[PDB]
Amino acid sequence: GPMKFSNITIKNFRNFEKVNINLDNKNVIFGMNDIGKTNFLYALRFLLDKEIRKFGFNKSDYHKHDTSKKIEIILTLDLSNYEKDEDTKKLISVVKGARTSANADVFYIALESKYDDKELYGNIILKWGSELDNLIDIPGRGNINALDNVFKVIYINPKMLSYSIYNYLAKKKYEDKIVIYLIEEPEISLHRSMQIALSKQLFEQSTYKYFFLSTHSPELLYEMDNTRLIRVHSTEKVVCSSHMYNVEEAYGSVKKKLNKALSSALFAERVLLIEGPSEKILFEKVLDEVEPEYELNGGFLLEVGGTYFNHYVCTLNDLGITHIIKTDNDLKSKKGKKGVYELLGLNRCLNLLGRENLDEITIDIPEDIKGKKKKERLNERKKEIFKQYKNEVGEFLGERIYLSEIDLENDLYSAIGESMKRIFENEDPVHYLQKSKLFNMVELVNNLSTKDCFDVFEHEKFACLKELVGS
Amino acid sequence: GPMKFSNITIKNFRNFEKVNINLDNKNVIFGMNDIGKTNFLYALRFLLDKEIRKFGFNKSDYHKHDTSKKIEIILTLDLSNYEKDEDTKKLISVVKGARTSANADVFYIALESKYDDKELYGNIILKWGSELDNLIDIPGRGNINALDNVFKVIYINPKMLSYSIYNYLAKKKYEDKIVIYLIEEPEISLHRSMQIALSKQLFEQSTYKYFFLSTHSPELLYEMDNTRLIRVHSTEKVVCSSHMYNVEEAYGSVKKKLNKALSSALFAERVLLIEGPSEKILFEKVLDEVEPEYELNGGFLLEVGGTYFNHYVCTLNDLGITHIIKTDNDLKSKKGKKGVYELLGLNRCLNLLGRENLDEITIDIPEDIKGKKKKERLNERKKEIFKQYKNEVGEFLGERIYLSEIDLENDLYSAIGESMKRIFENEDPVHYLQKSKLFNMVELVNNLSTKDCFDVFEHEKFACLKELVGS
């Protein structure tokens, strides 16, 4: 693989006590603690940009203003594909020596700084090379370091004209050096469509490579592909989590909706996954009637539709975001019917915990049986298979995965029984609600009372909302 | 009704040639031409804030730098409920005279300015009162005008602490004057959840009243209620459209999802309305395979689910946003079944054009007929009712409203027939796709080819995508 960033071990910086967060060329930093993201970007500027090193470090630049500690930010680089990667050649041409033949792939770039009290100016002492144990003397011919011929920081901070012309300027002038775009909040004066355009140029075109993107709007993350997403936790003590966000060719067709839905959820402290928009309407009504500040204390309703949760689960778990999923046990037929049914409702929850896909179970449904009787038989079979796999359901509850008894609507009817009958005035309100999920769900929500909302919220079969709200 | 702003007739300003856009206390300005929104906010500052009047007008402050023309911005106020509206008392206590007894409700506040060439300083000559024809001499005791005791502009431009403490400061200090918050892009350094919080305090709490909000992120418009949404058109010649955005008590329950979906669509030049997420997946795949820049040249996929389009149609039409709707003719039963069916697929399209709701039509479906035969009978009835109302369908095509022959999936099968059979390998792929819309639609999209996408795009039954793409 081409040359890629690997890790940065920021220690005793303005806010970073001791963090070793992985990197990979295309980087995205977001989340809480805007000062944390700003400090991370300025740490990269200190490690790579000469325009920031010359000012040195101050008393405030250290962690808790404690001048005793030493700033040590160590960028880690991975080198491979020497004969075809131009940037690898750019990095290894300037470095003369200090590269042990044992490990020609790894390359450290550290930055040691100790504060002196006789002058109140912490000197930036670059010490880069290939091994942490042994460092040779850096040339440092005056103000320009040897690193200055390799890594030049192009700082973008607000105007689409500048973004459009930086491509031309770098292509025609900065070919020799490696460009590292440290973009900090480019959504300041860009429209939603402008944010989409900038995301398309960033995450798809090769003109922006090795870029560190700071964003606060989900629109800038609509085209994420093989990047490294970095999320800063909400605590004042900065904790950052990293995840390779790459879409498989299986999800390539649905990549647009996948990214559009996941980008908004990336900024939520707690994310709840749902299948259909009727579930969205019901959960939104319940939350508005019990806790309208769910979006405020950290919450989201991620509508995934079909596909699988595997990509969503990996992305949400790697960033450390609270993981909540409520799903419906659905038995879908495939190829020849009448005895062929998959277990997507359960096959998903198995795939989230790994294991293996269940075989296509066979249900003996007579041909003459149809309509209400067929649905009753399917519900009985779903109840039987749910009662059979009690251990798997227990593991899902232990791993914050919620699976319905048969379907979501049956759980809703169990939580509130008389309210459904009063609203729909039918002997079988569940069947009527399944007849047209959207319109009937809207009608149910419009006539849904606060007491009914509280009953739904406090029921154990709807514990997803309780987990989303939190303490 | 309480005192409310009514209109501002900005003439010959920095970019506004001649515009008379309505106002109402809670105002939102967004869209293209960020300079246009900035000029509008500075026009309000000139008309109300003394901190901007003292600098006067410059050569650049006029339209096309033509000093011959005269700046004339005329704010229009509506006065009512005198005995209970404190702000009405605040406005009418300072004004002594100049209020004709014939019209005590309307109140103009103009601002005339002519450029002199002997000093190169356009004097701001305030002329306010109650009638355009006759104006009495304004007191103007020095630097502070008589208006300065009524309207004080609180300019907010980046930090949630300032927003939190402006409430306290205005409540404890600015009780006597009328506060007019001219908020310009508060999303500069606010998170998505912070934007939601600010929107909640703005559009719900009474502490922010008479505020002019400029936004570029849809997250700030998640709580819109009885405000006046102002959209600037994309042309360099500024055109602004206004609309009262108020939710009826019928839509109050679904208000959260309504606003969440509509806020994003508000920033799109062209908006296409869809019902289900499977439609979203299909349209996204087709667009990505024919025109990935649909989000760039102006486009959106508004998922409305159930409810009605009436609120959406009114909002999108009033702002002047291109209106595109693709819908499915669905016959939903109500109360006692077997002969009772509504025409939501057609009742909607009728309600969008006004008229009256069709009566609940009766379909003679025998009880023994079920499953495939019942669906076939329903499709035949839908085809018959579509062929019956050719004139209504022609009007919908004339008004950019697209109604399916029977359903969307049937139109998709008509557009591409062999591709569906190849992908699903079933004698009736449409029935299988309706069996589980989400998963089967995902499977179809994953195996959908570029030639099939082009065929779907160029077919007349999918003209919604062609209209969304445009020339």
Residue numbers in the entry:
A (entry chain D), B (entry chain C): -1 to 156, 263 to 575
What does the paper say about this structure?
Here we report the cryo-EM structure of the Gabija complex from Bacillus cereus VD045 at 3.6 Å, which provides the direct evidence of interactions between GajA and GajB. The resolved structure shows that the Gabija complex adopts an octameric ring structure with four GajA and four GajB. The whole Gabija complex resembles an octameric ring with three 2-fold symmetry axes. The three dimensions of the octameric ring are 171 Å × 143 Å × 91 Å; The inner diameter of the ring is 35 Å at the narrowest region. SEC-MALS results show that individual GajA and GajB exist in the form of tetramer and monomer respectively, supporting the hypothesis that the octameric ring of Gabija complex is formed though two steps: the tetramer formation of GajA and subsequent octamer formation of Gabija complex. The interactions within GajA1-GajB1 are mediated by the ATPase domain of GajA and the 1A, 1B domains of GajB. Size exclusion chromatography demonstrates that the NTR region of GajB indeed binds to GajA, while the CTR region of GajB doesn’t bind to GajA. There is a highly conserved region (E379, E383, D432, D434, D511, D513, K541) in the Toprim domain.
The Gabija system is a newly discovered bacterial immune system that consists of GajA and GajB. GajA is an OLD nucleases family protein, while GajB belongs to the SF1 helicases. The Gabija complex has sequence-specific DNA nuclease activity and prefers circular rather than linear DNA as substrate, its activity is more sensitive to concentrations change of nucleotides compared to GajA alone.
